[PDB]
Amino acid sequence: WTATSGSCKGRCFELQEVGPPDCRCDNLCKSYSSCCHDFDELCLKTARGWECTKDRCGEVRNEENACHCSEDCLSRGDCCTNYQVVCKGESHWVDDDCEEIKVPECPAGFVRPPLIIFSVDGFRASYMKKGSKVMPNIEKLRSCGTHAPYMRPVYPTKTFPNLYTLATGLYPESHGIVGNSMYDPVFDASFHLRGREKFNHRWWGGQPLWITATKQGVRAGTFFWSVSIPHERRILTILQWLSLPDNERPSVYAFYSEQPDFSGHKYGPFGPEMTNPLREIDKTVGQLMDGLKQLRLHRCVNVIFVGDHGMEDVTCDRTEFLSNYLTNVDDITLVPGTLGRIRAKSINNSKYDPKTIIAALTCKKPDQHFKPYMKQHLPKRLHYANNRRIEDIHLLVDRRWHVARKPLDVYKKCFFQGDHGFDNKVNSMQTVFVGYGPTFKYRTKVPPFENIELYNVMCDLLGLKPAPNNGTHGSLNHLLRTNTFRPTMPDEVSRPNYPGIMYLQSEFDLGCTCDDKVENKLEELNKRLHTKGSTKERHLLYGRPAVLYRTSYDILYHTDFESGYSEIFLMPLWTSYTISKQAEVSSIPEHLTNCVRPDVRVSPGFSQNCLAYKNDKQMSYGFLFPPYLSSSPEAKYDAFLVTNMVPMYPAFKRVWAYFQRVLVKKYASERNGVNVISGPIFDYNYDGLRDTEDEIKQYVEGSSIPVPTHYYSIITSCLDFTQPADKCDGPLSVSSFILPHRPDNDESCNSSEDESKWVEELMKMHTARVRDIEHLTGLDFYRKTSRSYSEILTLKTYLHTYES
Ligand SMILES: *[C@@H]1O[C@H](CO)[C@@H](O[C@@H]2O[C@H](CO)[C@@H](O[C@@H]3O[C@H](CO[C@H]4O[C@H](CO)[C@@H](O)[C@H](O[C@H]5O[C@H](CO)[C@@H](O)[C@H](O)[C@@H]5O[C@H]5O[C@H](CO)[C@@H](O)[C@H](O)[C@@H]5O)[C@@H]4O)[C@@H](O)[C@H](O[C@H]4O[C@H](CO)[C@@H](O)[C@H](O)[C@@H]4O[C@H]4O[C@H](CO)[C@@H](O)[C@H](O)[C@@H]4O)[C@@H]3O)[C@H](O)[C@H]2NC(C)=O)[C@H](O)[C@H]1NC(C)=O
Ligand SMILES: CCc1ccc(OCc2n[nH]c(=O)n2C)c(Oc2cc(C#N)cc(C3CC3)c2)c1F
Ligand SMILES: [Ca+2]
Ligand SMILES: [Cl-]
Ligand code: NA
Numbered sequence: 108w109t110a111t112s113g114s115c116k117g118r119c120f121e122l123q124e125v126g127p128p129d130c131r132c133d134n135l136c137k138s139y140s141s142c143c144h145d146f147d148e149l150c151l152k153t154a155r156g157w158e159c160t161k162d163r164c165g166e167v168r169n170e171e172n173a174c175h176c177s178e179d180c181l182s183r184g185d186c187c188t189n190y191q192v193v194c195k196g197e198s199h200w201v202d203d204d205c206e207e208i209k210v211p212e213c214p215a216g217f218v219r220p221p222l223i224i225f226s227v228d229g230f231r232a233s234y235m236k237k238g239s240k241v242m243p244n245i246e247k248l249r250s251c252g253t254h255a256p257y258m259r260p261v262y263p264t265k266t267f268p269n270l271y272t273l274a275t276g277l278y279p280e281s282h283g284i285v286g287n288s289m290y291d292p293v294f295d296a297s298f299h300l301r302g303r304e305k306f307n308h309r310w311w312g313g314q315p316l317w318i319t320a321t322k323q324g325v326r327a328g329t330f331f332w333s334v335s336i337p338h339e340r341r342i343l344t345i346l347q348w349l350s351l352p353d354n355e356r357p358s359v360y361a362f363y364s365e366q367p368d369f370s371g372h373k374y375g376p377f378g379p380e381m382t383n384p385l386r387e388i389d390k391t392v393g394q395l396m397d398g399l400k401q402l403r404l405h406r407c408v409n410v411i412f413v414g415d416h417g418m419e420d421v422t423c424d425r426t427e428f429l430s431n432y433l434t435n436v437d438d439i440t441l442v443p444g445t446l447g448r449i450r451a452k453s454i455n456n457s458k459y460d461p462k463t464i465i466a467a468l469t470c471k472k473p474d475q476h477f478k479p480y481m482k483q484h485l486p487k488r489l490h491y492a493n494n495r496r497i498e499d500i501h502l503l504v505d506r507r508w509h510v511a512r513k514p515l516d517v518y519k520k521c522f523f524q525g526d527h528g529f530d531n532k533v534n535s536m537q538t539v540f541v542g543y544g545p546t547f548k549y550r551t552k553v554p555p556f557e558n559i560e561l562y563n564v565m566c567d568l569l570g571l572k573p574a575p576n577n578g579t580h581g582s583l584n585h586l587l588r589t590n591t592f593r594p595t596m597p598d599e600v601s602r603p604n605y606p607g608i609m610y611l612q613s614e615f616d617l618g619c620t621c622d623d624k625v626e627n628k629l630e631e632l633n634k635r636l637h638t639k640g641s642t643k644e645r646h647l648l649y650g651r652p653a654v655l656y657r658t659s660y661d662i663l664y665h666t667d668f669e670s671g672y673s674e675i676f677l678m679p680l681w682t683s684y685t686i687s688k689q690a691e692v693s694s695i696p697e698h699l700t701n702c703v704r705p706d707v708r709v710s711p712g713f714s715q716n717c718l719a720y721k722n723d724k725q726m727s728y729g730f731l732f733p734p735y736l737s738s739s740p741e742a743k744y745d746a747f748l749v750t751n752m753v754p755m756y757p758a759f760k761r762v763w764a765y766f767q768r769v770l771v772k773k774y775a776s777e778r779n780g781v782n783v784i785s786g787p788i789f790d791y792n793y794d795g796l797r798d799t800e801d802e803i804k805q806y807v808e809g810s811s812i813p814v815p816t817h818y819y820s821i822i823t824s825c826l827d828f829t830q831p832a833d834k835c836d837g838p839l840s841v842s843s844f845i846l847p848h849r850p851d852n853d854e855s856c857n858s859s860e861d862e863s864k865w866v867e868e869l870m871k872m873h874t875a876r877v878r879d880i881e882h883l884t885g886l887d888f889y890r891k892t893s894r895s896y897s898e899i900l901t902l903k904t905y906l907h908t909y910e911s
């Protein structure tokens with residue numbers, strides 16, 4: 108209940124939220140149906156429109172006008188944004204040459220440059236180039252400020268998950284807005300875009316920027332605008348707040364446009380109808396910049412022009428129907444569209460079975476435009492699993508398509524030509540970033556980066572300490588002129604042991620055999636040197652990874668590779684090796700097919716054994732440093748050490764062998780040498796974080812050998828490919844993957860074909876940031892390069908997408 112009989116007189120767009128049942132006058136009151144009786148009259152004036160004309164100049168103030176052109180409007184702070192242009196011979200900001208803003212140029216009483224976040228819904232990255240002719244204001248921000256050619260949104264590429272990621276620096280699984288639609292089973296409550304339900308605090312985790320600012324004594328304008336407030340009024344309100352006195356004035360502001368997303372859904376991303384919406388956004392930007400210019404703030408304010416997601420071509424006829432797949436279609440609930448989420452229709456139905464639903468959805472039709480996953484099997488780069496609101500069964504839908512339950516859902520709900528939501532690496536989903544102002548760089552292009560990184564920089568821009576978040580603070584220092592955040596490398600927690608030869612062959616009873624009894628002071632001093640690390644600068648090119656948790660591990664050196672071997676998990680945490688352009692691939696000799704060799708540096712009790720793999724009918728093994736890439740027949744023996752062995756399902760060994768035999772060498776050819784760091788990942792609780800030993804759900808049968816959920820590789824080389832990977836003077840180039848360790852290749856519909864037809868496709872889908880591998884392993888990579896730490900942080904956030 109609201110006592111709407113109070114008044115908005117002198118309260119229009121007040122910053123405090125007034126408590127029920129007293130009537131509100133804030134930019135949220137419309138959404139709560141709680142505005143005072145006179146809110147529209149007083150706070151939503153429209154009389155005479157939004158622009159000054161010559162004949163209004165020097166008018167007598169008339170308080171009913173939307174905005175003013177009277178001589179007193181500047182001190183009142185309520186001129187039309189074009190007042191100075193029309194009435195005072197000034198130029199529009201867009202017509203002014205851009206000139207570097209070397210220092211903030213702020214009016215007295217401004218303690219720091221204010222930040223204005225201009226957020227646009229559905230603004231696809233390619234609009235910056237393709238619409239540049241109709242967006243002169245936005246083109247000026249982009250060209251004169253700092254811009255990325257695109258910015259990567261988060262999955263799902265939907266509005267609220269992405270806006271709240273911008274706000275919090277968190278993945279949707281952590282902030283809680285995991286879709287525009289959600290069921291929370293703990294609260295037994297549903298989230299929808301309609302009504303006031305979405306406003307309930309329980310949906311929104313983490314700490315958004317406006318709360319971060321408030322808690323630390325920086326005042327914030329309100330980030331949510333009711334849909335019925337016109338954009339001209341949003342801009343006027345922000346400009347009015349900016350003329351508040353010092354003590355009362357916010358330092359951070361947000362504007363929001365529902366366009367171009369609204370039209371894009373109707374017309375498709377490049378419908379001819381889309382030019383108008385783009386012009387209109389540009390005009391709104393021009394209003395803001397003109398208004399800042401009037402207030403003498405245009406060389407003071409940092410402006411961020413930022414999108415939430417793009418827009419793809421999607422039409423009703425491109426829908427897959429679960430009714431064509433499932434017999435039981437009425438026993439499921441489906442969240443539909445550009446992603447699918449499935450759960451049981453009724454939690455009383457114990458004939459519900461995820462295993463049979465998944466199997467009925469898997470490679471059933473030759474052109475099938477979606478792929479089913481248990482959420483833990485989704486590419487780790489998506490970070491879309493660790494929340495009770497994410498259903499176990501997920502459908503990744505091909506770009507340009509929808510999934511729906513039954514045909515009737517689509518015609519009793521073509522009425523649309525655009526949509527978004529797809530995998531966040533899809534080009535049509537990429538969105539925009541431009542920063543303009545004293546703290547941003549001048550005329551600077553920066554590589555694409557992920558929207559999860561922005562919260563940190565927004566905190567930097569405002570002098571705030573960010574709340575714990577998923578950005579990597581310092582990874583975007585290259586966007587900034589000043590206010591950089593200079594992180595230190597984390598300290599190593601566990602120091603390695605360096606074991607020498609400590610065990611005789613006969614102390615081992617591993618049930619392994621090797622035909623290795625095939626054997627000089629020339630060639631033995633040499634082998635000893637290798638085992639002492641004489642070739643380590645070749646194979647360990649960026650220093651040893653630091654272990655950031657308490658554990659017990661051994662550094663093991665070899666001619667061809669170096670490893671950090673965990674006595675806890677009985678396998679390497681990491682294995683590092685360099686493969687030059689000239690390296691040659693060989694096979695595993697016939698006599699060495701089943702060769703496994705005890706490592707005389709490591710006790711029996713801290714070794715795997717071959718009996719375990721013989722007895723486990725589901726589990727085989729592979730090796731981390733590939734025997735195929737041995738530098739000599741004698742070196743090959745090192746590759747068969749029990750300390751280089753890792754448990755692998757036969758199905759996964761298909762993938763791994765092809766990567767090791769064929770791809771590594773292909774990457775070395777193309778990249779002029781690669782350095783490879785490979786290892787296991789244990790994430791049984793799918794939280795994106797290294798499991799502790801007591802979190803492991805599966806072992807090689809009868810043993811203490813833990814089964815990895817994933818295997819990773821980090822493949823580094825010289826960004827200037829004229830330099831070989833092992834003699835690189837400059838910046839580095841990286842690609843990584845985190846391949847799921849699965850007992851079948853059901854994910855790959857073409858997997859009965861030759862590995863050359865499907866394995867690299869799998870790998871690309873499981874592309875990763877080095878940073879994702881750091882979280883999953885507790886390791887810190889690139890500790891010793893000649894590069895700046897911020898640059899290394901940027902490298903670590905890099906994602907190789909394979910989009911064109
Ligand atoms: C991306 O960035 C974020 C932020 O840095 C990372 O998330 C952090 O990860 C930490 C580890 O997972 C986690 O730490 C835990 O905090 C628990 C206290 O939780 C509350 O307080 C925080 C701080 O303000 C708050 O943010 C939390 O908010 C969560 O929950 C609310 C309501 O449910 C949501 O609104 C909100 O969205 C958020 O949910 C998300 O996280 C939770 C987990 O917190 C998930 O359940 C959701 O799926 C969702 O993703 C909370 O209100 C604390 O209790 C934990 O401590 C346990 O474990 C340690 C082990 O060292 C031990 O000392 C304790 O004994 C304790 O164990 C006891 O409880 C166990 C579990 O019930 C039980 O089994 C034991 O027997 C014990 O009794 C833990 O320290 C931190 O909360 C989050 N922060 C956020 C914001 O999500 C994220 O990891 C990053 N991702 C990647 C990939 O890098
Ligand atoms: C850059 C970060 C950012 C910018 C703009 C944001 O909304 C802008 C917005 N106006 N009107 C509208 O329909 N939309 C989506 C935003 O989302 C929210 C902000 C607040 C607040 N305060 C509250 C909510 C939930 C719905 C109740 C969401 C957001 F996080
Ligand atoms: Ca984990
Ligand atoms: Cl959704
Ligand atoms: Na076996």
Ligand code: NA
Nearest residue numbers: 852853855858
């Ligand atoms: Na298959």
Ligand SMILES: [Zn+2]
Nearest residue numbers: 229368372527
């Ligand atoms: Zn949309």
